[PDB]
């Protein structure tokens, strides 16, 4: 698809703690 959009969708989705039951 793209680099930067894969990059940002990589770290922005990871640094965020998603342990909360959403």
UniProtKB/Swiss-Prot annotation:
Signal peptide per UniProt: none
Reported tissue expression: Highly expressed in fetal brain, lung and kidney and in adult heart, spleen and thymus. Present to a lesser extent in adult brain, placenta, lung, large and small intestine and peripheral blood leukocytes.
Name the gene behind this protein. ST8SIA4
Job of this protein: Catalyzes the transfer of a sialic acid from a CMP-linked sialic acid donor onto a terminal alpha-2,3-, alpha-2,6-, or alpha-2,8-linked sialic acid of an N-linked glycan protein acceptor through alpha-2,8-linkages. Therefore, participates in polysialic acid synthesis on various sialylated N-acetyllactosaminyl oligosaccharides, including NCAM1 N-glycans, FETUB N-glycans and AHSG. It is noteworthy that alpha-2,3-linked sialic acid is apparently a better acceptor than alpha-2,6-linked sialic acid.
PTM? Autopolysialylated.
Where does the protein end up?
Answer: Golgi apparatus membrane; Secreted
Cite the binding residues for CMP-N-acetyl-beta-neuraminate. Answer: 22
What family name appears in the similarity comment?
Belongs to the glycosyltransferase 29 family.
Q: What is this protein called?
A: CMP-N-acetylneuraminate-poly-alpha-2,8-sialyltransferase
């Amino acid at each position: 698809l793209r680099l930067i959009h894969a990059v940002r969708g990589y770290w922005l989705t990871n640094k965020v703690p998603i342990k909360r039951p959403s």
